[PDB]
Design a binder for this molecule. Structure first.
Ligand SMILES: [Zn+2]
Ligand SMILES: [Zn+2]
Length: 530
């Protein structure tokens, strides 16, 4: 069979893990299409053939809760698929031929075409339905995809590159001191050769973005390193677990950094095209500072990576510290540097969420409010509604967010907002497998029925509606006289119950407008009375 040929080829292209369900005796065609319908493997495929065909910031790496994000991946695929691979528009399928399996036959043709490209074969790899929509009705899946932080992870490992179980431990203690010395003077190189020299050329609105950050990082580490060095020089080196813990809250600036970086850096890149006197000098600063091995972009990615490495270094120092009192202490600093890394990962996720939201906002016409105010996307896709003014099933597109349902009519790539629904006032009420009969009710208890193609779709939406509503009105929200509501804190915040940090940059938790308290959703009832 020809889809079996595709499979094999996709495996040869390192796109499909050779242990995946379309590999097993019995594998249906539908299992292949299931694995391609979010355009992710397809996007990776192109990159495995033409390195850098598609920049990852253009790929929606985990789009399964979103028809919108899957479609954008497939369009990115098809589009670079003709613009960078030769293929003619009569040789590449149309999005829904894939995402709604309206003609998977033509998707397989496109790949075969790809396999015969002067590029596929230029690489050693040999070239090569109706009932689909029904059959259809994944940690494994993305094993072969570049995860989002690999680009930076190599810049970092390049920059840092250089028995018994005491030589093993000491070997680790030297990795910690050396990478730190090297990290610390790297920040210094960025200031001295970049941020200072550049200050003059650029408005304090073009550079002011990066400098306050880098400079604060240089000061913290410059000091960090002094105290790291001392605790190491002293016999044994047991004061070390204390340096890490002492500096944890100081290191929370990495949140602000790993939050503003990606934008001042895209801004730097815009002032690239928009000037010659600039583009020409960030080759100088480069050439001068390190002799052209690293651009300023390259270096701005380094702090995001460095902060994520501390728990890893300590994790290994801990494997080789046999002493009982030693271990339980290093595991304290390890606890602190792992939390640090978890906070930064929270900032990375909210960064991404905000990109998706901006994405929806640019494709939604007749929308007069900022989507960010309505919490985070839960799921978006095609359903059928009737309200109390219609009865004939109206086909509509919906975006669900924590605080709102956007009912819309899709017009190609643009979505017209026909009915914003403020979910503060609504509640979910449930009610033979006939395709499109699976409905539950969305009712205000002082005032729509939603139909889903399949039982599983309905379950997946109803589940999201419940999480959304639970976020609006969590348990104990009104407990002890409080009035807790979702809230995006601007400044680093801790909870008035678990005393630990609210994580992220965007709807980190809840706030009682009355006592000013802040809490995690779970910590809510443990919060001292209003
Ligand atoms: Zn808390
Ligand atoms: Zn209160």
């Amino acid at each position: 069979e020809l889809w079996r040929q595709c499979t094999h080829w996709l495996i040869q292209c390192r796109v499909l893990p050779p242990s995946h369900r379309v590999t097993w005796e019995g594998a249906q065609v539908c299992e292949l299409a299931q694995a391609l319908r979010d355009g992710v493997l397809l996007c990776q495929l192109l990159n495995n053939l033409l390195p850098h065909a598609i920049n990852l910031r253009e790929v929606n790496l985990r789009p399964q809760m979103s028809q919108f994000l899957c479609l954008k991946n497939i369009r990115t695929f098809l589009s670079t698929c003709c613009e960078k691979f030769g293929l003619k528009r009569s040789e590449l399928f149309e999005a829904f031929d894939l995402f709604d399996v309206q003609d998977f036959g033509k998707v397989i043709y496109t790949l075969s075409a790809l396999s015969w490209t002067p590029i596929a074969q230029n690489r050693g790899i040999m070239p090569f339905y109706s009932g689909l929509s029904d059959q259809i009705d994944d940690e494994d899946l993305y094993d072969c995809v570049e995860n989002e932080e690999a680009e930076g992870d190599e810049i970092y490992e390049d920059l840092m590159r250089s028995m018994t179980e005491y030589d093993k431990r000491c070997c680790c203690l030297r990795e910690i001191q050396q990478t730190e010395e090297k990290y610390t003077d790297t920040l210094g190189s960025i200031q001295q050769h970049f941020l200072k020299p550049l200050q003059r050329f650029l408005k304090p609105q073009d550079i002011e973005i990066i400098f306050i950050n880098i400079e604060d990082l240089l000061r913290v580490h410059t000091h960090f390193l002094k105290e790291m060095k001392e605790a190491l020089g002293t016999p044994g080196a047991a004061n070390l677990y204390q340096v890490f813990i002492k500096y944890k809250e100081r290191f929370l600036v990495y949140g602000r950094y790993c939050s503003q970086v990606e934008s001042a850096s895209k801004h730097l890149d815009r002032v690239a095209a928009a000037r010659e006197d600039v583009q020409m000098k960030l080759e100088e600063c480069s050439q001068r500072a390190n002799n052209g091995r690293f651009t300023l972009r390259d270096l701005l990615m380094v702090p995001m990576q460095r902060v994520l490495k501390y728990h890893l270094l300590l994790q290994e120092l801990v494997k080789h510290t046999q002493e009982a009192m030693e271990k339980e202490n290093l595991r304290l600093a390890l606890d602190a540097m792992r939390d640090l890394a978890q906070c930064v990962n929270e900032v990375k996720r909210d960064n991404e969420t905000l990109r998706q939201i901006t994405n929806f906002q640019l494709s939604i016409e007749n929308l007069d409010q900022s989507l960010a105010h309505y919490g985070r996307p839960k799921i978006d896709g095609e359903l059928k509604i009737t309200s109390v003014e219609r009865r004939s099933k109206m086909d509509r597109y919906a975006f669900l967010l924590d605080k709102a349902l956007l009912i819309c009519k899709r017009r190609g790539d643009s979505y017209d907002l026909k009915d914003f629904v403020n979910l503060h006032s609504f509640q979910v009420r449930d009610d033979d497998n006939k395709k499109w009969s699976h409905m539950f009710l969305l009712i205000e208890d002082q005032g729509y029925e939603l139909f889903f193609k399949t039982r599983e779709l309905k379950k997946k939406w109803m589940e999201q509606f419940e999480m959304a509503i639970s976020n609006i009105y969590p348990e104990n929200a009104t407990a002890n006289g409080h009035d807790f509501q979702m809230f995006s804190f601007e400044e680093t915040t801790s909870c008035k119950a678990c005393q630990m940090l609210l994580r992220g940059t965007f709807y980190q938790g809840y706030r009682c407008h009355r006592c000013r308290a802040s809490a995690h959703k779970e910590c809510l009832g443990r919060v001292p009375p209003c």
